[PDB]
Design an enzyme around this catalytic site. Structure first.
Site, mmCIF file in Angstrom:
data_model
loop_
_atom_site.group_PDB
_atom_site.id
_atom_site.type_symbol
_atom_site.label_atom_id
_atom_site.label_comp_id
_atom_site.label_asym_id
_atom_site.label_seq_id
_atom_site.Cartn_x
_atom_site.Cartn_y
_atom_site.Cartn_z
ATOM 1 N N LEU D 39 38.853 34.388 29.574
ATOM 2 C CA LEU D 39 38.210 34.292 28.263
ATOM 3 C C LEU D 39 36.933 33.455 28.315
ATOM 4 O O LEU D 39 36.862 32.455 29.038
ATOM 5 C CB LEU D 39 39.179 33.708 27.233
ATOM 6 N N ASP D 40 35.936 33.877 27.538
ATOM 7 C CA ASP D 40 34.638 33.200 27.455
ATOM 8 C C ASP D 40 34.700 31.916 26.616
ATOM 9 O O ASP D 40 35.718 31.633 25.973
ATOM 10 C CB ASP D 40 33.579 34.159 26.897
ATOM 11 N N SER D 41 33.606 31.149 26.639
ATOM 12 C CA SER D 41 33.471 29.905 25.867
ATOM 13 C C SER D 41 33.480 30.139 24.353
ATOM 14 O O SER D 41 34.007 29.316 23.599
ATOM 15 C CB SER D 41 32.204 29.153 26.280
#
Lengths: 55, 169, 118, 85, 457, 55, 58, 166
Positions: D39-41
């Site tokens: 998952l991204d920031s």
């Protein structure tokens, strides 16, 4: 004559839980139900003298 | 009774002409509640009256009249003025409650007419203006806290102003 | 009172010398916190602790009356203008109302017909 | 309504699986969103907002940095709401 | 009948054993307070005379009953305090409260201006010792020095005034004798004659100027929040203003006009300061300035309505403000610092006291007619006959009286008390008794306060 | 999310429904009136009040 | 102003009749004279407008 | 803490978007439009331009700043039951229960005596453990977790490990 007598009953019925608030009688959980029953009969004693006024 | 003005005669009589339905519900309750607790309270009041039997007489209000006014007693003296100060104070306490009776007469005027109120009566409003104006100009109402010596000065102030106006005109 | 927009994401240095100063803020904060933490979690305490920040707070308002205000400057005279000033202000308000009333009693009657009071 | 320890593990897992950003086989219970799940920031704040709205939205920004693992996020949500006696 | 039972209360404390003391001082004062309500309430057409002038009579004094009511009430409050001190000093202290009440019986009963004044100043010495000893806070000496600096510098001008009047006109002594009263012709020599009679009762009745006498005596309290009730009695101790304005100078009241104006800003600006201050006792101390300023406004108008409101307010303030000091006493005995911000939280620890907080705070406002509304409303209606603009100034005061009560409530309604480990026990039997014995006489005066507001009523 | 029907809620609001539907039919019809101005301007004043709510 | 038709509505109200709603004939008679009184006030405003029009022309 | 500044601004942007929109399908559309804005610029590393974009992010956020934000549930501050339905009786009041009344429910009284005995005995060990972890003079901002936790009991628990609930 009864118009003046029954008019003060509405004032008296609402004060009866206040007069019997400090200890008085042992009634837990019934006290919130006591407020409901006091106003219900106070409505009936207010309906009669208004019918006297319309008359 | 006697001192109270009261109404002349009370009217009202039952008609019951239009419709049947269930007659008059208020009049049906009037006959019902007359025997329910109105008759019981009347019987209890009669039982309390019968249980009284012997009662004390009580000679009511004391008289005590005149004893010479403050205007009659010339020159300052503690023995003479003391009874005069009490006489003026007793009259001032009565004159306060005279206004209160006529005040309650005007209270009766408002209720016993209702619809008319201002257009009718005519006597109670006129009697109020005759007493209050006399109370305002003579019995303090401008002379601060009550004093017997100040009242004589207030009466002399009104008399000197009236004499100066009458002589000029 | 704030003049422009509500100050929260506006006007700040981009991670310069202020970062060393911001780290110093937590150092003094925790120093007063740790001595508070030690005098809290014991069952044998029983009693409200002092906290010298609130003791000096009460001393700043109740005391410091005559150690302060020893240079009575022109600003104190401006404060005195708000002091005596309003007391002398009503002198030309109540008297003007009274001379209006008292002249109406004697010449050209303005007194009430049903005035039994006073 | 009462909340249980089994209920916290069921409601958070169903909300995470419905997000469609991560596979049901990739994230189970202990697989972290920071590296393991993928998952991204921006996705970390998006998953935290979705999980809060489903149960009881009271997630501060200071606790958002600590919340990275779904097992830790379920425990932090139970601690603030005082769930499971 | 009120001479030598209070003087017989003096050897009672000394003779009684160390185990008793407090049981005897309270019980043998409550029956004495019963006799005051039994005998003094009777009135004829005008003022009576009980005896020859050693102690005279009552004209408009149900305020005597209030002092007799506080005769055991001070002993109720000082129970947790003076519990760890010496037994000989306990006997020494109660006698000093009795001596205060002894001269207070004398001052209200004696219808003199000469005998009244020297016993009015005989209440100053016992209070000085009561303030400067057993004071919990530092710099209590400033509260002692300024107590006799402000009062005596204003009251010693009565000796040059009162003796001057009796040298010219008969004698002041009997008062009911003094109706030889000549109207004051408004001369420059009569200017200082009026001022000297007033300035003595401009200190104890706090204005805007010369008002610092009061808060210093309350912040540096005599005993915690127990002997402050005696300082409430000193506030109503300036009742000589009712007698001086009526008898000595009725004509010249042009000099009263600036003093009403000075006390008019002693209503708004004294209430403004009482909003931010940290000390809980000071929030009662500055509110007590404004409620007693109402009387100073009233008396100088000299209208019959103002006297009805004033005499009611003297009794009203004597039972409401003193009750608020008992609430300040209950908070100080647990925390040991009167900071309002620190002591925060009712109902979580004190459930029953919170209802007593309401029945004491809301009485500063005009509730369903207790005695405070009856006190205030007659004064406001009296100020309109004086001048129409007054209610604009008086209306602002009605807003900040809500900022008195609710601000005292809200800062105690905020449920936290995180730092507080103390205040574990809710209340003692005597602690709640103070809350009842102050409020229930106010509740009984709701029905018929005819024997309260009575200068010819 | 659950929203359950309570025996206390139904009996309270249903009795108010009689009071909300039958108020003007009973109270304003029985009470004595004093000078009714409803006569002038039907398209400019009388019908415009109901039409404004529709618009 | 009407009085004659207005008293008849009070005469209907003088008799009791529980749950009063069935008295429209007296109310319609009271409204009929009130509409005529409103028309008389409207005709008075019309006559004032007609007199002002004649005064402006001359 | 530049990474925190981007996250806090993005967290505020999502919870402020729901106040402007009405329906849930419209909320998803505008969120993806916001995802098109932030993800495109975060990919490349910027030293001056990243702070320039963050200061430009104040605009648009301030143009649409106050439509009364949707803080619907029990949120810290704001609106709608922030610290409400709270009797919250502390442990200090739980010790001053009166005799002939504290006898009711004896299981709660017997357990609390064991909890108090556990705290009084471990406080001397907690003071040594807490006092041991010190950099020099004062702490460097943060709590003190147990390092040598053999038996049990962290250095500093009673209010933290004894909340009233809600």
């Amino acid at each position: 004559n009864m118009f003046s007598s029954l008019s003060l009953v509405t004032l008296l019925l609402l004060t009866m839980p206040i007069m019997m608030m400090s200890f008085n009688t042992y009634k837990p959980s019934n006290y919130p139900l006591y407020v409901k029953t006091a106003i219900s009969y106070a409505f009936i004693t207010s309906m009669i003298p208004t019918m006297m006024f319309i008359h | 009774x006697x001192x109270x003005x009261x109404x002349x005669x009370x009217x009202x009589x039952x008609x019951x002409x239009x419709x049947x339905x269930x007659x008059x519900x208020x009049x049906x309750x009037x006959x019902x509640x007359x025997x329910x607790x109105x008759x019981x309270x009347x019987x209890x009041x009669x039982x309390x009256x019968x249980x009284x039997x012997x009662x004390x007489x009580x000679x009511x209000x004391x008289x005590x009249x005149x004893x010479x006014x403050x205007x009659x007693c010339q020159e300052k003296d503690v023995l003479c003025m003391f009874e005069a100060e009490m006489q003026w104070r007793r009259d001032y306490k009565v004159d306060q409650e005279i206004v209160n009776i006529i005040q309650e007469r005007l209270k009766a005027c408002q209720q016993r007419e209702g619809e008319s109120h201002r257009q009718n009566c005519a006597k109670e409003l006129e009697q109020f203006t005759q007493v209050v104006k006399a109370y305002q100009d003579r019995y303090x109402x401008x002379x601060x806290x009550x004093x017997x010596x100040x009242x004589x000065x207030x009466x002399x102030x009104x008399x000197x102003x009236x004499x100066x106006x009458x002589x000029x005109x | 009172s704030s003049l422009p927009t509500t100050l929260d994401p506006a006007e700040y240095d981009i991670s310069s010398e202020t970062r060393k100063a911001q780290a110093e803020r937590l150092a003094i904060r925790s120093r007063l916190k740790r001595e508070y933490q030690l005098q809290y979690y014991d069952p044998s305490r029983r009693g409200v602790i002092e906290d010298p920040a609130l003791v000096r707070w009460t001393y700043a308002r109740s005391a410091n009356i005559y150690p302060n205000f020893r240079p009575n400057t022109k600003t104190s005279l401006l404060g005195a203008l708000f002091g005596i000033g309003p007391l002398v202000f009503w002198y030309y308000v109540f008297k003007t109302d009274r001379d209006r009333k008292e002249k109406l009693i004697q010449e050209g009657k303005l007194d009430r017909t049903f005035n039994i009071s006073y | 309504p009462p909340l249980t320890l089994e209920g916290i593990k069921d409601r958070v897992l169903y909300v995470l699986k419905l997000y469609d950003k991560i596979d049901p086989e990739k994230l189970s219970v202990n697989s972290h969103f920071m590296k393991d799940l993928g998952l991204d920031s921006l996705d970390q704040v998006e998953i935290i907002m979705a999980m809060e709205d489903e149960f009881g939205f009271e997630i501060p920004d200071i606790d958002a940095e600590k919340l990275m693992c779904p097992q830790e996020i379920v425990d932090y949500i139970a601690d603030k709401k005082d769930v499971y006696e | 009948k009120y001479i030598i039972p209070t003087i017989m209360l003096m050897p009672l404390t000394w003779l009684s054993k160390n185990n008793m003391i407090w049981v005897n001082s309270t019980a043998h004062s409550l029956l004495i307070s019963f006799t005051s309500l039994l005998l003094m309430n009777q009135f004829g057409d005008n003022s009576l005379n009980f005896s020859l002038l050693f102690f005279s009579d009552s004209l408009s004094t149900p305020l005597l009953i209030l002092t007799m009511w506080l005769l055991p009430l001070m002993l109720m409050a000082s129970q947790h305090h003076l519990s760890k001190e010496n037994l000989t000093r306990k006997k020494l202290f109660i006698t000093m409260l009795i001596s205060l009440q002894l001269f207070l019986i004398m001052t209200f009963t004696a219808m003199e201006l000469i005998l009244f004044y020297i016993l009015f100043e005989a209440t100053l010495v016992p209070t000085l010792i009561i303030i400067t000893r057993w004071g919990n806070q530092t710099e209590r000496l400033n509260a002692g020095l300024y107590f006799l600096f402000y009062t005596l510098a204003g009251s010693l001008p009565l000796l040059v005034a009162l003796i001057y009047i009796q040298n010219t006109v008969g004698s002041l002594n009997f008062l009911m004798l003094q109706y030889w009263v000549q109207p004051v012709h408004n001369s420059w020599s009569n200017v200082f004659m009026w001022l000297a009679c007033m300035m003595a009762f401009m200190v104890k009745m706090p204005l805007y100027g010369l008002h610092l006498w009061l808060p210093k005596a309350h912040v540096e309290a005599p005993i915690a929040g127990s002997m402050v009730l005696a300082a409430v009695l000193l506030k109503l101790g300036g009742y000589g203003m009712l007698r001086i304005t009526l008898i000595l100078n009725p004509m010249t009241d042009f000099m009263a006009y600036p003093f009403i104006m000075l006390s008019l800003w002693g209503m708004i600006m004294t209430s403004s300061i009482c909003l931010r201050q940290t000390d809980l006792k000071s929030l009662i101390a500055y509110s007590s300035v404004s409620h007693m300023a109402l009387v100073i406004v009233a008396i100088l108008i000299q209208t019959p309505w103002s006297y009805m409101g004033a005499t009611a307010l003297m009794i009203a303030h004597g039972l409401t403000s003193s009750m608020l000091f008992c609430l300040a006493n209950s908070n100080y005995e647990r925390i040991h610092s009167r900071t309002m911000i620190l002591a925060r939280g009712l109902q979580t620890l004190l459930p029953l006291m919170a209802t007593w907080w309401l029945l004491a705070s809301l009485t500063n406002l005009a509730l369903p007619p207790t005695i405070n509304l009856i006190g205030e409303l007659f004064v406001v209606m009296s100020t309109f006959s004086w001048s129409n603009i007054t209610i604009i100034l008086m209306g602002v005061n009605m807003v900040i009286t809500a900022l008195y009560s609710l601000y005292m409530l809200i800062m105690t309604q905020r449920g936290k008390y995180t730092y507080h480990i103390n205040n574990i026990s809710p209340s003692f039997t005597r602690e709640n008794a103070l809350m009842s014995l102050h409020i229930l006489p106010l509740l009984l005066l709701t029905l018929n306060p005819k024997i309260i507001l009575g200068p010819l009523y | 999310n659950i929203n359950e029907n309570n025996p206390l809620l139904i009996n309270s609001i249903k009795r108010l429904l009689i009071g909300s539907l039958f108020a003007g039919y009973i109270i304003s019809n029985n009470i004595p009136p004093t000078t009714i101005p409803q006569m002038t301007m039907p398209y400019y004043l009388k019908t415009t009040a109901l039409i404004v709510t529709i618009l | 102003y009407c009085a004659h038709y207005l008293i008849r509505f009070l005469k209907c109200k003088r008799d009791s009749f529980p749950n009063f709603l069935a008295c429209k004939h007296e109310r319609h008679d009271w409204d009929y004279c009130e509409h005529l009184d409103y028309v008389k006030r409207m005709k008075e405003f019309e006559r004032e407008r007609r007199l002002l029009q004649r005064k402006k022309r001359r | 803490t530049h990474q925190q500044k981007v996250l806090r601004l993005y967290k505020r942007a999502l919870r402020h978007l729901e106040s402007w929109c009405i329906h849930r399908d419209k909320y998803r559309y505008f969120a993806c439009l916001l995802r098109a804005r932030f993800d495109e610029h975060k990919n490349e590393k910027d030293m001056v331009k990243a702070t320039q974009l963050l200061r430009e992010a104040e605009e648009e956020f301030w143009h649409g700043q106050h439509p009364q934000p949707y803080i619907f549930p029990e949120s810290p501050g704001g609106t709608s039951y922030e610290r409400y339905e709270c009797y919250k009786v502390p442990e200090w009041c739980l010790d001053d229960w009166h005799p002939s009344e504290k006898a009711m429910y004896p299981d709660y009284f017997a357990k609390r005596e064991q909890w108090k005995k556990l705290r009084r005995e471990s406080w001397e060990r907690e003071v040594k453990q807490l006092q041991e972890e010190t950099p020099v003079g004062g702490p460097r901002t943060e709590a003190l977790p147990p390092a040598r936790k053999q038996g049990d009991l962290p250095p500093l628990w009673w209010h933290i490990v004894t909340r009233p609930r809600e």
